[PDB]
Symmetry: C2
Subunit: 68 residues, 2 copies
Amino acid sequence: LRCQCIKTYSKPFHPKFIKELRVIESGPHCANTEIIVKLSDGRELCLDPKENWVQRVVEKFLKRAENS
Amino acid sequence: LRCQCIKTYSKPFHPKFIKELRVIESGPHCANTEIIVKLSDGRELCLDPKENWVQRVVEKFLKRAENS
């Protein structure tokens, strides 16, 4: 698949709203690394991997889900 | 979808072999949190979120891909 994100979500939010995370590294398919999250209600958003708050949300989600 | 993993990969490997990561938190669909990686060659594996080496591989992959 080509790039999946048209734009990224720019307002911080709590990691409890994420139920699924997908990280696709850049490559021939898309010049950017893309982060796609599926929220508790099933909507999806793209996050900017460079933002510090995104990195923190990803990390928390993972710490949670890991011991789930 | 129900649980996607029949079994997890138990031998440590280098994060350079991962090109995509999917983390699905447990819920009604599957009692376990599942970690599915797509390798550089397109094969997929499931990893055990509880293993320390998995957590370290996930973290490295993310640090890489983030500044990609």
